[PDB]
Paper text:
To clearly understand the mechanism of the R156A mutation affecting peptide binding, the crystals of pSLA-1*04:01 and pSLA-1*04:01 (R156A) were both solved with the same peptide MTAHITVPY derived from FMDV (MY9 in short). The MY9 peptides in the two structures had a clear electronic density map and adopted the traditional overall “M” conformation. However, a comparison of the main chain structure of the peptide (root-mean-square deviation (RMSD) = 1.172 Å) showed a significant difference in the central region of the P5, P6, and P7 residues, which are recognized by TCR. This led to conformational changes in P4-His in the two structures. The Tm value of pSLA-1*04:01 (Tm = 45.6°C) was slightly higher than that of pSLA-1*04:01(R156A) (Tm = 43.4°C). The nonapeptide binding motif of SLA-1*04:01 determined by RPLD-MS perfectly matched the existing conclusion derived from structural and peptide binding data: PΩ has obvious selectivity with aromatic amino acids; the B pocket allows many hydrophobic and small residue insertions; and the D pocket prefers the negatively charged or small amino acids.
MHC-I is a cell surface glycoprotein that is responsible for the presentation of both endogenously and exogenously invading pathogen-derived peptide antigens for immune surveillance. Peptides anchor the antigen binding groove (ABG) via interactions between peptide residues and pockets, denoted A–F. Polymorphisms alter the stereo- and electrochemical environment of the pockets, dictating their ability to accommodate different peptide residues, thereby influencing the nature and quantity of the bound peptides (4–6).
Numbering used by the authors:
A (entry chain A): 1 to 275
B (entry chain C): 1 to 9
C (entry chain B): 2 to 100
Write the structure that this text describes.
Amino acid sequence: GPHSLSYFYTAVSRPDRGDSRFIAVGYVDDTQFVRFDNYAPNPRMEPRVPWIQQEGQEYWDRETRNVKETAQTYGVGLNTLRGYYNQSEAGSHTLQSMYGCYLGPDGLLLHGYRQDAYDGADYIALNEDLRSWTAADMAAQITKRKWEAADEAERRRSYLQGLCVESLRRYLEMGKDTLQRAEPPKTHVTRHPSSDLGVTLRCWALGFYPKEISLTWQREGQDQSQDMELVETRPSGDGTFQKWAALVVPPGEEQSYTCHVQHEGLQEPLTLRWD
Amino acid sequence: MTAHITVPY
Amino acid sequence: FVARPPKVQVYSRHPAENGKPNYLNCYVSGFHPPQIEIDLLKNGEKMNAEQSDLSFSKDWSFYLLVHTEFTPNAVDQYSCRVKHVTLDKPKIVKWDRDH
């Protein structure tokens, strides 16, 4: 349904073992399209899909420099956090940020978001109003006072309502080919003779886009997620996604079980049996 | 397009 | 702070059939901090691999995809070997074309 533009920043302090590492990745829905990494041999903002390269040189110039500034500010913020939590200058630490915007049907902001984590735990988050902040602890409260004084929420709101959705609108036409078409899953059921008191039924979903999907198993109509193994959705490596759901059934009751697949690329809920 | 960083932590 | 061991999934890009080119993938996910070492191995010996860009999930845990071109056959054995601060020794997960 809704389309999104999102950026993910990771900053890793390597304390007196170098300089701070910074990597940024950009996504339009579940498709990555740019990347920057300052531990890379030659840090530059690079394309990662074909369509994004039909952009001009000005784009790569602006984006490269902007993320290069952001990386230095994050190297600063890592040591600021170091101080807030009163931590030593020797152990490595992590600062993550994710932000982005979802487009409504009208072509304007449905909702925007911006959240940070320090060492894998919630730090500070912009609330859905794009005007107030939720701080997880009293160090994030220091950061929140700073951002209240600088009226930072208004800066983020201006970005999320303007440049974010405008960039997303343009990206959604440069990559019209693959961004605005859904790929339904290619599904099949696999049988494994495990023992003589159980065979394993595996329901596969391959080559689907976007990432969200529902895979469940039923017997004569009732759900069996209570005894079902469900792997985390994983990338195929070509921009699509894979998943499977397996369960143990008695030998001879294979037809008694059905796999149910739900995905926006399908016209109606899919049902599957081992054949 | 990425956002400009406007505040420190 | 936090430390999380990676979930490791070893699989092919497409369903494996002997003789046809394909991609071997090791997907590491749900780990933290970001430093991690991944090797793809053919019959216990290391291969030469590419990898996706570091990103993370909604719960802040990292994920990476390492992959390499390969042609499966009946007897060659493939695996992924992962090293992380949470792992006292490198963890090996073997490829099963059915999982």
